Amino acid sequence: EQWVLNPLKVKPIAHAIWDPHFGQPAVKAFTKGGVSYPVNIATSGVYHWWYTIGMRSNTDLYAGSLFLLFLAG
């Protein structure tokens, strides 16, 4: 929802980091993307694909995830 508004300046986040072997400087250095927790910066391009095909918010992303969970079942 932040990336749709400013696609060419905001760094896309793939998923969150929870690693208990981290020290504090590693926690600080991975805190990017405008969030308050360590994240990995996405390289898969799912942001551009999902934005181009008409998804704008987080709600329809979750609904698509539910539909694919149901389809897999």
Binding site: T59, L66, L69, F70, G73
Partner: peptide, 30 residues
């Protein structure tokens, strides 16, 4: 944003998919 209830619903669907995957694995194992 997403709430706790939505994550719980996704977890329930994933558990249903886990049961179905276990059943498919048992069917394939004869």
């Amino acid at each position: 944003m997403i709430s706790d209830t939505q994550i719980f619903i996704a977890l329930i669907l994933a558990l249903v998919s886990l049961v179905l995957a276990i059943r498919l694995g048992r069917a394939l194992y004869q």
